[PDB]
């Protein structure tokens, strides 16, 4: 009762009352109350500075609100900004929801062709939308870059990148926006060609640049494809998460492998496949490549070196004797502070550290059991294990990890107070699925000292996790599992300090935001491609898909 009339905000058909344009400072992490990009900041940390919820009170966390989401693979993220959650659902449904109450504000529903016409169903999942200025940005299953008005959800512009639906190019991770350029990778997992990263003007929709990865006869690296004709080089894309450093003004992404996985079937025997499984640092306005490094050459294992890599500042002091250390860079600047690009880029589970500005190699370290990499030298040159390349049809090829890792898309998090990189992993191997030798627990989270490479703790549990982490200033790590358990761990020890259990597998991202001084922890759940993948190895756990939704927790008031 305000005036004598009933003022209403009809759910799904309303506007945000007060929307303030999103700035580069917001996206660099400038307002701890918000989570305006997939990993909280451009630099990829997956961290919240909010500490209302901490190791002493997290045991009291209760369900504040939840809301049903579209059916399908539910890998998305609650992108939170000034009291509104912007939520990419499966099937190109995008919602704005009041972050305090759970009331739907607006809902955009894309009109799509029937699912049967898409040769690449991976684009039906949507790990994130992006924010910039006055618009919400996403890449559609049919391969358009799309901008919606943030206040109302109405379509602003859409740009068809080409080759979606029947030709198989799509996007599953979502774009980021840097200084007015929407940057988006692609998946072309089922296509007889490679794909790209594009930059598109955020206000006009004009494509500004497009980077591809497969060299052509005449270009540097063509001689590393084993003589395979250019038209037999397939599936190399960049489907993972994009990060960015504002000060260096460098965008970071990784390309993937070539398809099929067997080099004999591809006709690339002996080829290291320049352009594949390469970490690029590029300028956002033009796509110009500044530096690059191939983290998995001659891939025969669908290793997909496209996952997020973090920009952090650390003392550089790798311990050559740390568990899993592969090598230390020849002239590492020991004892100095550097801005580094660091993390695990590929399913194989090997963590890498480079100078963020120059690409100089500092170190690499294995986590899970792996046998595709025989060694890495002091310049970061990887030598693969010839005995894991399929040659004779009758031999046993016991590869570690698997096509789901190791790691896969589920993201790591960073704890700046302890300088720890925290990564969710799977202790799996398979016949080129089973538990890796000596492991009884499929699910694993490792916490690695970014300065030394030493593993400080490891949490393990029977069920596969296959879900991102979120790190917090409250000394907590949140992580979900295939058997529906949503946990908080003590960030100092890895020990479980709280849990709940949701209707389905915890399959999407965890984010955190504050409204009126109250901290909320939002997780997307229901199921993904991974939920049922570990069943042969872990039959005893109640891993089930269903109940797709956003679920938001907070402390009692
Ligand atoms: O090669 C590719 O284009 C592409 C795309 C995707 C996708 O976009 O989600 C995955 C993979 N590859 C892949 O190799 C993989 O293991 C995988 C797991 C998932 C998932 O949703 O859980 N997506 C994908
Ligand atoms: Ca317009
Ligand atoms: Ca290099
Ligand atoms: Ca793949
Ligand atoms: Cl508009
Ligand atoms: Cl318009
Ligand atoms: Na605008």
Rounded Cα distance between 158 and 143, Å, is 10
186 ligand 1 Cβ < 6 A = no
The 10 Å CB-count burial string (b at 16+, else e) for 341-372 is bbbbbbbbbbbbbbbbbebbbbbbbbbbbbbb
Question: Which residues pair with residue 298 across a beta bridge?
Answer: none
507 ligand 1 Cβ < 6 A = no
Ligand closest to Cα of 149 equals 5
404 ligand 1 Cβ < 6 A = yes
- Extract the tokens encoding 75: 């890998």
CA atoms 475, 422, 364, 397: torsion sign: positive
Determine the residue of 140, 191, 214, 239 to mutate for testing ligand 1's pocket, defined as the one with the most ligand atoms within 8 A of the Cβ atom. 239
Give CA separation, 101 vs 19, 62, 83, 520, in Å: 17, 14, 10, 11
Ligand closest to Cα of 190 equals 1
Could you tell me which residues come within 8 angstroms of residue 5 by beta carbon, excluding any fewer than 6 positions away? Answer: none
In this structure, are residues 170 and 123 in contact, taking their beta carbons and an 8 Å threshold?
Answer: yes
CATH for 24-554 is 2.140.10.10
Rounded Cα distance between 304 and 146, Å, is 26
Is the backbone of residue 213 left (phi > 0), alpha (psi -120 to 50) or beta? alpha
143 ligand 1 Cβ < 6 A = no
Determine the residue of 73, 75, 122 to mutate for testing ligand 1's pocket, defined as the one with the most ligand atoms within 8 A of the Cβ atom. 122
Alpha helices, DSSP H only, in 195-257? none
* Positions of E strands within 394-450: 398-399, 413-415, 420-426, 428-431, 434-435, 443-449
In this structure, are residues 131 and 113 in contact, taking their beta carbons and an 8 Å threshold?
Answer: no
294 Cα to the center of ligand 3, angstroms: 7
Comparing CA positions, the residue from 278, 537, 295, 272 lying closest to residue 400 is 537
DSSP state of 36: -
Three-class DSSP category at 205: coil
Rounded Cα distance between 369 and 433, Å, is 14
Preceding residues of all breaks in the chain (C to N beyond 2.5 angstroms)?
432
Name residue, tokens 């209760």.
62
Q: What is the dihedral of CA 109, 115, 117, 123, to 10 degrees?
A: 70
409 ligand 1 Cβ < 6 A = yes
Rounded Cα distance between 166 and 185, Å, is 19
Question: Which residues pair with residue 160 across a beta bridge?
Answer: 144
In this structure, are residues 395 and 345 in contact, taking their beta carbons and an 8 Å threshold?
Answer: no
In this structure, are residues 515 and 98 in contact, taking their beta carbons and an 8 Å threshold?
Answer: no
Name residue, tokens 């579209």.
70
CA atoms 322, 325, 327, 333: torsion sign: negative
Give CA separation, 464 vs 235, 482, 485, 541, in Å: 28, 6, 10, 9
Closest CA to ligand 1's atom 16? 404
Q: Tell me phi and psi for residue 65, to 5 degrees.
A: -160, 165
Q: Are strands 398-399 and 428-431 parallel, antiparallel or unpaired?
A: antiparallel
Is the backbone of residue 40 left (phi > 0), alpha (psi -120 to 50) or beta? left
Peptide bond into 401 cis (omega under 30): yes
256 ligand 1 Cβ < 6 A = yes
Could you tell me which residues come within 8 angstroms of residue 229 by beta carbon, excluding any fewer than 6 positions away? Answer: none
302 Cα to the center of ligand 4, angstroms: 6
467 ligand 1 Cβ < 6 A = no
Rounded Cα distance between 295 and 351, Å, is 10
In this structure, are residues 308 and 412 in contact, taking their beta carbons and an 8 Å threshold?
Answer: yes
Domain regions of the chain by residue span? 24-554
Rounded Cα distance between 41 and 382, Å, is 30
Rounded Cα distance between 165 and 200, Å, is 21
The 10 Å CB-count burial string (b at 16+, else e) for 430-444 is bebbbbbeebebbbb
91 ligand 1 Cβ < 6 A = no
Chain centroid to Cα 328, Å, comes to: 26
Q: What is the dihedral of CA 462, 463, 464, 466, to 10 degrees?
A: -130
The structure was resolved experimentally with X-ray
User: DSSP letters along 425-439, please?
Assistant: EE-EEEE--EEPTT-
Q: Are strands 413-415 and 250-254 parallel, antiparallel or unpaired?
A: unpaired
How many C-alpha atoms does 447 have within 13 Å on its Cβ side?
Answer: 26
299 ligand 1 Cβ < 6 A = no
How many C-alpha atoms does 12 have within 13 Å on its Cβ side?
Answer: 4
- Extract the tokens encoding 55: 């190791």
325 ligand 1 Cβ < 6 A = no
- Extract the tokens encoding 331: 């002239």
Closest CA to ligand 1's atom 2? 189
């Amino acid at each position: 009762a305000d005036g004598a009339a009933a003022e209403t905000a009809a759910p799904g058909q309303s506007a945000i009352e007060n929307f303030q344009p999103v700035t580069a400072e917001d996206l660099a992490g400038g307002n701890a109350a918000n989570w305006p990009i997939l990993r909280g900041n451009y630099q990829g940390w997956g961290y919240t500075q909010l500490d209302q919820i901490n190791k002493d009170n997290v045991g009291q966390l209760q369900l504040a609100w939840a809301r049903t989401m579209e059916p399908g693979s539910n890998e998305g993220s609650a992108i939170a900004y000034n009291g509104v959650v912007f939520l990419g659902n499966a099937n190109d449904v995008v919602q704005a929801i009041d972050g305090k109450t759970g009331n739907l504000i607006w809902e955009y529903r894309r009109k799509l062709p029937p699912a049967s016409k898409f040769i690449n169903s991976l684009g039906a999942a949507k790990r994130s939308i992006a924010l910039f200025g006055d618009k919400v940005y996403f890449v559609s299953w049919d391969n358009f870059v799309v901008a919606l008005d943030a206040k109302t959800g109405k379509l602003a512009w859409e740009t068809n990148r080409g080759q979606g639906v029947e030709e198989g190019v799509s996007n599953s991770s979502g774009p980021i926006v840097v200084d007015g350029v929407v940057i988006a990778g692609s998946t072309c997992q089922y296509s007889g060609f490679g794909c790209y990263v594009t930059g598109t003007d955020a206000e006009s929709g004009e494509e500004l640049w497009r980077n591809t990865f497969i060299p052509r006869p005449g270009e540097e690296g063509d001689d590393t494809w084993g003589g395979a004709p250019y038209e037999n080089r397939w599936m190399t894309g960049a489907w993972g998460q994009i990060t960015y450093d504002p000060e260096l003004d460098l965008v970071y992404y990784g390309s993937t492998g070539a398809g099929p996985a067997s080099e004999v079937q591809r006709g690339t025997e002996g080829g290291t496949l320049a352009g594949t499984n390469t970490r690029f640092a590029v300028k956002p306005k033009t796509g110009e490549v500044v530096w690059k490094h191939q983290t998995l050459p001659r891939d025969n294992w669908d290793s997909e070196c496209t996952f997020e890599m973090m920009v952090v500042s650390t003392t550089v002091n790798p311990d050559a004797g740390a568990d899993g250390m592969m090598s230390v860079g020849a002239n590492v600047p020991r004892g100095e502070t550097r801005k580094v690009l660091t993390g695990v880029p590929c399913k194989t589970g090997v963590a890498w550290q480079f100078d963020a500005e120059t690409g100089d190699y500092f170190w690499s370290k294995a986590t899970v059991e792996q046998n595709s990499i025989a060694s890495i030298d002091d310049k970061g040159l990887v030598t693969v294990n010839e005995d894991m390349i399929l040659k004779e049809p009758g031999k046993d090829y016991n590869y570690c990890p698997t096509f789901l890792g190791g790691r896969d898309w589920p993201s790591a998090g960073y704890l700046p107070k302890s300088n720890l990189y925290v990564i969710p992993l799977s202790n799996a191997c398979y016949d080129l699925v089973k538990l890796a030798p000596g492991k009884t627990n499929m699910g694993r989270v490792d916490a690695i000292d970014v300065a030394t490479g030493a593993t400080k703790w490891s949490f393990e549990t029977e069920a596969a996790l296959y879900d991102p982490v979120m790190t917090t200033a409250g000394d907590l790590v949140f992580v979900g599992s295939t058997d529906r358990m949503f946990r908080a761990l003590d960030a100092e020890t890895g020990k479980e300090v709280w849990s709940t259990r949701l209707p389905g597998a915890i399959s999407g991202y965890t984010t955190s935001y504050s409204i009126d001084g109250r901290q909320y922890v939002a997780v997307v759940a229901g199921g993904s491609l991974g939920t049922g993948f570990f069943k042969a190895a872990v039959p005893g756990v109640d891993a089930v898909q269903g109940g797709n939704g956003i679920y938001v927790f907070a402390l009692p008031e």
